[PDB]
Design a protein around this ligand. Structure first.
Ligand SMILES: Nc1n[nH]c2cc(-c3nc([C@H](Cc4ccccc4)NC(=O)NCc4cc(Cl)ccc4-n4cnnn4)[nH]c3Cl)ccc12
Lengths: 7, 238
């Protein structure tokens, strides 16, 4: 994904 | 899901079943894994839910019969409802569940990509709505996760179909002119997943409709691309 959600 | 078919195990690994334990345990809504502690779902699912303590998130489920008292689940630490949300029909029907523990990714449970800002102009031709919802207005929660392929409808065409409502660009509609295939009761909060360049994107969140799969009544979904900054605000908070 281009949109990233931080772990 | 009306006019759908049984999904194959592992087909929609971002799909979750959100259960309530109050007064008794039952499926409440669908949802999507978007991060290792994040579920994206519909704000209207939490009407009367006074605490996240009564919620259980089950991932990696094909059949509701897989869920018993000994089945593992994710607890919910926090319910984050869009603060402009009033009702599904007025929009902002979006919410995040912050999980008490981390989802370990695998072939049974993994995230779906959020849409790209540059992809607000892309034409999605391969969209599917999934859930354990009713197959008709008077039915029951289905055991097996169902799927139905549905075409996206322009905002202009959707507005013509919903006289008396205001269909905003924060909403996205999907359905056949003659009806037959759609989301129904129990599907809300779940994904509208579209495949583009061999990658699935979370294009919509099942929100509302007048009846289920009726002719000239497309399903209305939260248009996820319009909420990417809101999602990042909440999940990437410093
Ligand atoms: N355990 C349970 N037993 N029965 C249940 C039946 C439900 C149930 N879910 C719902 C939800 C609304 C809602 C969510 C949570 C709590 C209370 C209400 N609606 C939809 O899931 N579908 C809307 C829709 C979206 C779209 Cl895009 C196209 C058409 C429609 N529909 C229009 N009319 N119906 N669907 N209603 C009913 Cl009853 C849940 C659990 C259970």
């Amino acid at each position: 994904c281009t949109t990233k959600i931080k772990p | 899901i009306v006019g759908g078919t049984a999904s194959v195990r592992g087909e929609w690994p971002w799909q979750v079943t959100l259960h309530t334990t109050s007064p008794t345990q039952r499926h409440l809504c669908g949802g999507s894994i978007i991060g290792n502690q994040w579920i994206l779902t519909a704000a209207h699912c939490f009407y009367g839910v006074e605490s996240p303590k009564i919620l259980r998130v089950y991932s990696g489920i094909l059949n509701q019969s897989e869920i018993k008292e000994d089945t593992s689940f994710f607890g919910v630490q926090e319910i984050i409802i869009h603060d402009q949300y009033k009702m599904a029909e007025s929009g902002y029907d979006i919410a995040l569940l912050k999980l008490e523990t981390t989802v370990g990714y695998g072939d049974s449970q993994r995230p779906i990509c959020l849409p790209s800002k540059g992809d607000r102009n892309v034409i999605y031709t391969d969209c599917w709505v999934t859930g354990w919802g009713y197959r008709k207005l008077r039915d029951k929660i289905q055991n097996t996760l169902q799927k139905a392929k549905i075409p996206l409808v322009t905002n202009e065409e959707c507005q013509k179909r919903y006289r008396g409502h205001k269909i905003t660009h924060k909403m996205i509609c999907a359905g056949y002119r003659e009806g037959g295939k759609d989301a129904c009761k129990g599907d809300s909060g779940g994904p509208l997943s579209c495949k583009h360049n061999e990658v699935w994107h979370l294009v919509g969140i099942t929100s509302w409709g007048e009846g289920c799969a009726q002719r000239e009544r497309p399903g209305v979904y939260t248009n996820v691309v319009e909420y990417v900054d809101w999602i990042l605000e909440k999940t990437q908070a410093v």
